[PDB]
Design a protein around this ligand. Sequence first.
Ligand SMILES: Nc1ncnc2c1ncn2[C@@H]1O[C@H](COP(=O)(O)OP(=O)(O)O)[C@@H](O)[C@H]1O
Ligand SMILES: Nc1ncnc2c1ncn2[C@@H]1O[C@H](COP(=O)(O)OP(=O)(O)O)[C@@H](O)[C@H]1O
Lengths: 244, 244
Amino acid sequence: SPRTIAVTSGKGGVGKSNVSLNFSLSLSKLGFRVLLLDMAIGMGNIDILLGESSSLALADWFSARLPLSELVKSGPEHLSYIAGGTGAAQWQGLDTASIDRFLTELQAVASQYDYLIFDMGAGASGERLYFLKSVDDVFVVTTPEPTAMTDAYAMMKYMHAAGSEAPFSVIVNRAGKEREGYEVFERLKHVTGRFLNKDIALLGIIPEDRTVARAVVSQTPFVLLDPAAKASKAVRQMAFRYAP
Amino acid sequence: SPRTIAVTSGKGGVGKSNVSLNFSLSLSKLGFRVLLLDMAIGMGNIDILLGESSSLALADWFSARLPLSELVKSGPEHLSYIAGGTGAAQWQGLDTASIDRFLTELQAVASQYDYLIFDMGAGASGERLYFLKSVDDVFVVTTPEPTAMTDAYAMMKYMHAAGSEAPFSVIVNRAGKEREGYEVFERLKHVTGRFLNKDIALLGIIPEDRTVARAVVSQTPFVLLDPAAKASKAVRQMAFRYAP
Ligand SMILES: Nc1ncnc2c1ncn2[C@@H]1O[C@H](COP(=O)(O)OP(=O)(O)O)[C@@H](O)[C@H]1O
Ligand SMILES: Nc1ncnc2c1ncn2[C@@H]1O[C@H](COP(=O)(O)OP(=O)(O)O)[C@@H](O)[C@H]1O
């Protein structure tokens, strides 16, 4: 059966979507079959980062009983994905019931992949914390800024309070120096272990790199736009270390 | 009798909290009575940016039969504010009835201010949209990035579809050149004006500035840390133009 990963964060602006897509693409390149799901319904960024014209999206599954398998889009390197959507006139969100049915139709087309990767909406919500208790791995993205780190810790506290028992792995992104990344992680590891009795791990450290910004403007993922960039190697390396 | 302003964004990481805080400080410095409310309950960032330690916050208000009046904290330059809080063993979310409670109790002190400024959670929610219709002005913050701009559009579309009659004013933050701010605004004004038949205004353009990031690490608001910085003058002049 496929391994499920949810990528999350304390707050937006930590590069969580960029990490999700570029980590998924690295997994694809190693030869795995990956389905990436943009769980930001009506506010999805996965399509934009690939520079793909908006077409059918998850929000459409909410709105026409269309089966999930027809939402599945092909991306570079054999990556499959499902977009969050541009939405209709009015706002639409997920509740626990609709989350439930979604998970059901998902396993119907899940068995094909080695990995199912969920790009979660940033931060916490009742419905998001509900979704997160089922996954095998929870990735938590943070940067070295105090706001991002404080919010990452809160997020881990809430997922834990809401009975998530999944292993938490930290991705320290936008690190200035490699030591700085380890020290961000030590701080988070200290507070989670002492206050929550929760032992977390470091998935990897991604440096601050202009290539990322360049990749976003040009709408071409950085691991593909420049595989030799520092961030690109850091993410390829993270994926390699994660995979068996 | 105060004027109410909700500062919103399509996605996090656009500088919204920094803009909310530094714009409020500029208004207070012009001599107005300002109350800033951090609506990111359980994930408050305003305390952090100010370098002030915890104290009571919305997270203590939520569960614990306590009047908003007692959450008011004194910030620099005579700014008053209410912190979102660090939580809370468990996640807690504003629902329709808690918003009513909030807005009701808010009327007990609203009278003592010229401006109430709500630093809203980023993105949309059924709850946020219910909150955003008792406000006079909606500021929408974006950067020149395509993800940020697309999300800002969708947020404006959602607020408009939910019956919001308030004028939308855009803040383009992290502009590389002042001209890029106009390029960003022109695109947004275009798609909103042609598709939604909604006339939006430019509140101002804030340049990319290392000073901002320095202010976050130093936990001292950038307009106070260095009043001469480019971003600091931009925000000060934005507030001057907005105030009577
Ligand atoms: N490693 C990095 N180096 C430089 N900029 C980065 C890096 N990671 C992320 N960013 C910047 O952060 C912005 C927001 O990234 P995004 O993936 O949208 O984050 P989130 O999903 O956390 O909001 C990007 O558009 C880019 O400017
Ligand atoms: N004008 C700017 N110049 C440089 N960096 C900025 C600017 N505005 C925001 N930032 C950066 O963006 C980060 C996130 O800002 P924040 O106010 O927390 O955004 P949001 O509330 O939209 O998530 C800041 O800590 C800082 O690194």
